[PDB]
Design a protein around this ligand. Structure first.
Ligand SMILES: CCCCCCCCCCCCCCCCCC(=O)O[C@H](COC(=O)CCCCCCCCCCCCCCC)COP(=O)(O)OCC[N+](C)(C)C
Ligand SMILES: CCCCCCCCCCCCCCCCCC(=O)O[C@H](COC(=O)CCCCCCCCCCCCCCC)COP(=O)(O)OCC[N+](C)(C)C
Ligand SMILES: C/C(=C\Cc1c(C)c(O)c2ccccc2c1O)CCC[C@H](C)CCC[C@H](C)CCCC(C)C
Ligand SMILES: *[C@@H]1O[C@H](CO)[C@@H](O[C@@H]2O[C@H](CO)[C@@H](O)[C@H](O)[C@H]2NC(C)=O)[C@H](O)[C@H]1NC(C)=O
Ligand SMILES: *[C@@H]1O[C@H](CO)[C@@H](O[C@@H]2O[C@H](CO)[C@@H](O)[C@H](O)[C@H]2NC(C)=O)[C@H](O)[C@H]1NC(C)=O
Ligand SMILES: *[C@@H]1O[C@H](CO)[C@@H](O)[C@H](O)[C@H]1NC(C)=O
Lengths: 693, 35
């Protein structure tokens, strides 16, 4: 009756006492929308297990006998052998199918939940927001009575056939989606999102073509992409709940998610959010959709009559609340409070803090920070002889996220410490030097390059002392530097560097990179050439021509950070391009009839196009033929029909699913009936990898 | 194999031309099979 009563659905007096709150949170509600969401979520996760979880690639990630450095949340966790991992994924698949079909719902939910979180916590390099969301949804749905409508348990059990469900089942999901939208929006109130730096190059996609009929590219990249996204997050959080705004909110949210699906490669996140969007609608929309159909079709679709009473609700005649109702209310309140708190819990677990806040995955800060790494050097000093050596940047690793987090760096250092003695290295001391820029800033060190990470100190609840601060004082320079980026030719390239007081950088210019120069933008540096031991002190706005093929050091000798730049052009590439262009001009002259004089013998293979019955072509001729073939391939790719691409996509996905199924079969057979001789295994592995055709 | 170790000449090369990777940290598993 009250206006608040219709707007919000509940009256204020319901919150006076615990009993009234429990009765409100356990009132009857229709089960249809929850059942549809359960079906869609189960089906999408079933499709997602062989694609993103990595069951197709599981045989080259956890291969037995290979030594790789793992990054688990807890050091205690260790992967099992490959076959048991295949069994774990089979259990996941069975649980997901059970959730989809509503068959043994609680058991299926547990079988999906526990393996999923095991995989999620086993590796920190595979964390993203849309995996955390799937984990949370699986956790929530374990307790919700979602097997009441369109479920096989209903057919096998009369009491759970089209029955009522309590109201907090919908409330928890609605709150979760609202939290996702709102926290994503508020997290996007950052200086690098409101000013157009994050996703600065996404306005070129053809989906934004109509906007370009009325707005320029720069304006389209700010008003639509950034401010539009932020406003859509906050407004889509609020609007869908209210009755009046549901249609416009649904339209904008659906357009937003379809554009996200096409623009990015996030995966199944867009479809999951689309499936969750109807959940804010009335709890009985599928029933009225079913009713408005022919009777013959209604003979196959689920029941349409009013639901029967359930014992998971409190009815007002009354009925004193039991125990599960109180637990449901407490679970709802505590879970939503924890969900609000966790994204902002970064001041307690300070070990994981960096330039960004906390580990990625549970902050809802999607597509806000972009990083470009320029150089990574790993140096080791032997603990017996004193020799100094250099390792490859990414050895014994499968991801590139260790370059930005202190904990992963410490784990990598310990892994290298335990592995290197297999290669005649005594107790080593490992030093790291990583150059990274976030949102197009100066390249700067992230970690102190004088600290042995093997013996350094790290605890989750105390700040790490060997992470360099982000120099945010140089923020406005991002304008001017960009101008210098646009003043160059098609050959010249520029790299910007900002360095701390006391430190130095030692660099080696390759023989190819002739005509390399160094200019100083701010501060005071001294550049040392070591071939003749000569150092020159550069003032602001002075340029030097560095040697090619030697080592040079740049030292910072000012109390404040110094900013400089390297400008270089590749001489070998330019010379090859010019010679190839001359050759192409001669070829064209021959083709059109000009150059009546005899062709050189080396040119005869070029016209023939095949090396048969003659001397082997020079490397330049081979490069020309390769370039021509690549250009022809690209041209053929461009002039390609859509239907062929669609058929190829279907075939590729078929191959992925086939490989997953066959390899899982091999693993299960090995577990149960033992391992055959090696020849049969080789034959089977050859059979599985066969392309479908 | 002997790909664990590298050389001083090829380690101290800040200026090496390469491609650009946005690395949004939200797009699937990035290069996937490559690395
Ligand atoms: C805000 C979310 C975060 C804080 C949550 C705090 C914990 C919950 C405390 C208890 C809340 C009251 C009891 C449960 C919810 C409730 O009253 O019942 C529900 C209300 O819906 C919910 O479950 C709301 C969950 C939170 C979702 C986010 C709401 C955003 C509100 C924005 C400001 C206004 C009854 O809905 P109904 O289908 O009967 O429709 C009523 C509204 N229309 C008709 C417009 C669709
Ligand atoms: C009530 C309804 C309410 C609304 C619900 C809305 C949500 C419903 C979602 C349900 C699921 C719909 C299908 C999803 C398909 C899907 O996601 O496709 C894919 C994943 O799904 C698939 O491809 C599934 C393929 C399964 C295999 C099908 C094989 C069929 C073979 C048929 C016979 C062929 C015979 C040939 C010889 C004659 C996503 O692609 P991606 O993430 O790799 O993206 C790559 C490209 N970009 C980056 C550009 C996007
Ligand atoms: C990349 C963007 C957001 C990140 C993101 C993603 C990928 C999600 O999966 C989310 C899911 C749920 C909640 C938040 C999510 C999220 O934050 C902006 C997307 C680019 C751009 C804004 C799309 C353009 C379409 C809108 C409708 C334009 C309206 C502009 C009017 C002026 C017409
Ligand atoms: C060239 O200039 C640099 C700039 O400092 C000189 O470096 C210092 O060199 C001394 C002697 O090796 C070291 O003890 C200091 O620690 C260095 N300073 C810093 C900040 O690291 C260098 O010696 C000069 N070279 C020559 C050949 O004169
Ligand atoms: C500079 O430009 C040259 C142009 O060739 C690049 O070179 C090739 O370099 C790769 C290794 O990176 C060789 O395998 C190829 O054979 C070279 N191609 C030739 C000679 O045609 C080179 O990588 C660029 N960068 C640097 C630092 O030199
Ligand atoms: C030396 O290192 C090589 C490379 O592994 C190998 O011969 C062995 O590990 C070591 N042998 C001796 C005698 O040091």
């Amino acid at each position: 009756d009250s206006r608040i009563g219709k707007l919000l659905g509940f009256e204020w007096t319901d919150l006076s006492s615990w009993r009234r709150l429990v009765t409100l949170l356990n009132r009857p509600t229709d089960p249809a929308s929850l059942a549809v969401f359960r079906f869609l979520f189960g089906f999408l996760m079933v499709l997602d297990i062989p694609q993103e979880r990595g069951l197709s690639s599981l045989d080259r990630k956890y291969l037995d006998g290979l030594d790789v450095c793992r990054f688990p949340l807890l050091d205690a966790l260790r992967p099992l052998p490959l076959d048991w991992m295949y069994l774990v994924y089979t259990i996941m698949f069975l649980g997901a199918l059970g959730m989809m079909l509503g068959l043994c719902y609680r058991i299926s939910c547990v079988l999906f939940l526990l393996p999923y979180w095991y995989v999620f916590l086993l590796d920190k390099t595979s964390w993203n927001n849309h995996s955390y969301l799937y984990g949370l949804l699986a956790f929530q749905l374990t307790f919700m009575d979602a097997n009441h409508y369109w479920s096989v348990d209903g057919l096998l059990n009369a009491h759970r056939r089209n029955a009522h469900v309590p109201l907090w089942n919908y409330a928890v999901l609605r709150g979760q989606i609202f939290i996702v939208y709102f926290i994503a929006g508020v997290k996007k109130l950052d200086a690098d999102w409101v000013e157009g730096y994050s996703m600065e190059y996404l306005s070129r996609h053809w989906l934004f073509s109509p906007f370009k009929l009325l707005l320029s590219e720069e304006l389209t990249s700010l008003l639509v992409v950034h401010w539009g996204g932020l406003l859509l997050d906050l407004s889509a959080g609020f609007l869908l709940f209210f009755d009046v705004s549901r249609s416009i909110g649904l339209f904008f949210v659906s357009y937003f998610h379809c554009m996200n699906s096409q623009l990015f490669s996030i995966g199944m996140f867009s479809y999951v959010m689309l499936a969750s969007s109807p959940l804010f609608c009335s709890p009985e929309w599928p029933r009225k959709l079913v009713s408005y159909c022919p009777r013959r079709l209604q003979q196959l679709l689920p029941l349409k009559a009013a639901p029967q009473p359930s014992v998971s609700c409190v009815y007002k005649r009354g009925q004193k609340p039991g125990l599960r109702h109180q637990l449901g209310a407490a679970f709802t309140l505590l879970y939503l409070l924890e969900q609000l708190f966790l994204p902002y819990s970064h001041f307690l677990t300070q070990g994981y803090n960096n330039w960004t806040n906390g580990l990625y995955g549970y902050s809802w800060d999607m597509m806000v920070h972009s990083r470009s790494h320029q150089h990574v050097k790993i140096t080791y000093r032997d603990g017996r002889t004193g020799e100094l050596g250099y390792l490859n940047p990414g050895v014994f690793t499968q991801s590139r996220r260790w370059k930005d987090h202190a904990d992963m760096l410490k784990q990598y250092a310990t892994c290298l410490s335990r592995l290197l003695p297999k290669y005649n290295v005594t107790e080593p001391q490992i030093y790291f030097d990583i150059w990274v820029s976030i949102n197009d800033r100066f390249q700067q060190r992230i970690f102190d390059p004088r600290v042995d990470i093997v013996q350094a100190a790290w605890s989750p609840f105390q700040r790490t002392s060997w992470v360099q601060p982000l120099l945010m004082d140089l923020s406005p320079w991002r304008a001017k530097l960009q101008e210098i980026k646009s003043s160059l030719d098609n050959h010249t390239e520029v790299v910007f560097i900002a360095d701390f007081p006391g430190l130095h950088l030692e660099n080696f210019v390759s023989e190819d990179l002739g005509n390399t120069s160094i200019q100083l933008l701010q501060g005071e540096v001294t550049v040392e050439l070591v071939a003749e031991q000569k150092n020159q002190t550069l003032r602001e706005g002075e340029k030097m021509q560095l040697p090619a093929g030697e080592y040079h050091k740049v030292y910072t000798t000012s109390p404040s950070p110094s900013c400089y730049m390297y400008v270089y052009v590749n001489t070998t590439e330019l010379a090859l391009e010019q010679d190839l262009a001359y050759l192409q001009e001669l070829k064209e002259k021959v083709e059109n009839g000009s150059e009546t004089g005899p062709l050189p013998p080396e040119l005869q293979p070029l016209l023939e196009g095949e090396v048969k019955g003659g001397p082997e072509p020079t490397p330049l001729v081979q490069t020309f033929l390769r370039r021509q073939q690549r250009l022809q391939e690209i041209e053929r790719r461009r002039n390609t029909p859509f239907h062929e691409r669609f058929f190829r996509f279907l075939l590729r996905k078929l191959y992925v699913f086939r490989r997953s199924f066959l390899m899982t079969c091999i693993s299960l057979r090995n577990l149960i009936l033992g391992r055959p001789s090696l020849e049969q295994l080789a034959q089977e592995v050859t059979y599985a990898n066969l392309r479908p055709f | 194999l002997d790909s664990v170790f590298s050389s001083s000449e090829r380690a101290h090369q800040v200026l090496r031309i390469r491609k650009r990777a946005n690395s949004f940290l939200e797009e699937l598993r990035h290069s996937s099979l490559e690395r």
